[PDB]
């Protein structure tokens, strides 16, 4: 980098590296401490977090607990399963968060015959955020997930009040259809760009609420998680992958490279 920046021996020598999962900007250890650590007199009683995470367009809900060897997944549901239940579009929206969360609750609570805490991760807590969508679905789903109402959309700021006519509307995609409506007579340039697939499968707005309404039914009816079929084995995926992973060296090879180098770069061209 910059000549008069650059790093001394002494800088590096005494540098204390942060964790790794911190270097990665992925773990808030301060919040993790407080999420995980258990009352000392409840002994080996695991403290299960419901982890909700948003990728660029897949939602992740795992129920996780901890172990000094590593954390431990009890249950996992991904919003990409939702085609299974009759959901194909907008699956990182507030309603896919709800749906996925309900899928998580129903699924685990099944394989159990349950108290659990929200790991928001690094998400901001803004009112109307969709992490909290996950929460509602896991809670309407059957889990005991301790929570308050003031981050669900349709929470009145300037009064301690929830409009649930609104929050229902979000669970079902009502803000998405209403946009989808509104775009059907003020601009079809854009309505064909985004909302494309809805044309391509003939699902115009009004129906949006039913898709989710019956995604719900479908889910409670069979939450039991279908793994993908696979196609190619452990071994193959491995083998084709090693075609693309460089492999280190011997000191012997490196030794030559320098000796070779002092043959070239040195003895007067």
């Amino acid at each position: 980098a910059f000549q008069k920046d650059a790093k001394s021996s002494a800088y590096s020598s005494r540098f204390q590296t942060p964790f790794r999962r911190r270097r990665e900007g992925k773990t808030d250890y301060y919040q993790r401490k407080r999420l995980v650590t258990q009352h000392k007199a409840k002994y080996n009683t695991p403290k299960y977090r419901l982890v909700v995470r948003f990728t660029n367009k897949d939602i992740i809900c795992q129920i996780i607990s901890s172990t000094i060897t590593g954390d431990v997944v009890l249950a996992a549901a991904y919003s990409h399963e939702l085609p299974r239940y009759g959901i194909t579009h907008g699956l990182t929206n507030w309603a896919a968060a709800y749906a996925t969360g309900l899928l998580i609750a129903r699924r685990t609570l099944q394989k159990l015959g349950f108290k659990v805490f929200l790991d928001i991760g690094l998400q901001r807590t803004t009112t109307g955020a969709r992490v909290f969508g996950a929460l509602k679905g896991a809670s309407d789903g059957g889990l005991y997930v301790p929570h308050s109402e003031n981050r669900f959309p349709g929470w009145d700021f300037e009064t301690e009040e929830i409009d649930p006519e609104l929050l229902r509307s979000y669970i079902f995609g009502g803000h998405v259809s209403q946009y989808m409506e509104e775009l059907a007579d003020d601009d079809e340039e854009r309505f064909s760009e985004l909302f494309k697939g809805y044309l391509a499968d003939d699902i115009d707005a009004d129906s949006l609420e039913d898709i989710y309404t019956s995604a719900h039914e479908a889910i409670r009816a069979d939450p039991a998680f279908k793994p993908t079929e696979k196609k190619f084995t452990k071994e193959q995926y491995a083998a084709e992958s090693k075609k693309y992973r460089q492999t280190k060296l011997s000191k012997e090879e490196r030794a030559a490279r320098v000796a070779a180098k002092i043959a070239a770069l040195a003895g007067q061209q």
């Binding site: 980098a1 990665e24 900007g25 992925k26 991760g121 690094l122 901001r124």
Partner: protein, 169 residues
Amino acid sequence: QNPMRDLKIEKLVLNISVGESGDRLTRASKVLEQLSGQTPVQSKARYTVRTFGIRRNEKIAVHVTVRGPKAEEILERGLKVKEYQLRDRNFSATGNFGFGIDEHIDLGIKYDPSIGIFGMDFYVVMNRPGARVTRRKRCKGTVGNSHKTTKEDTVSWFKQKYDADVLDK
């Protein structure tokens, strides 16, 4: 290579130093408002000076940051004023640049004698796509070497579109 490592402007930040609070500052503010449409921000003196006649926390200067299209207008519009001639300094080693103009009228904007005239500081910070990596909350990273904005690269950018001249050695 080049695809997707274009060279957008991150932001333009106009700045008005005024060795005092009061009318003369709220007027500098008024200028930046009507010129940006955004309501501008005030800055307090960091320590007290005396030979500059200011006290810690005095409110001494306003400024405003402006992004996308609107940025380019005011850039070019005041870039005009400067006859499309900057200098070889003016550009930072990290590839941003700026200039001053006095008389904030030399770029649209009437006179109004109950407003006065002000000088402005123009400062243009440049970047490429994927600036977000160094700026979002999670997995905050630093941008790869062969992606960083530089002086060479930004000058050449300026010399091109705009057509303007660089100047000096």
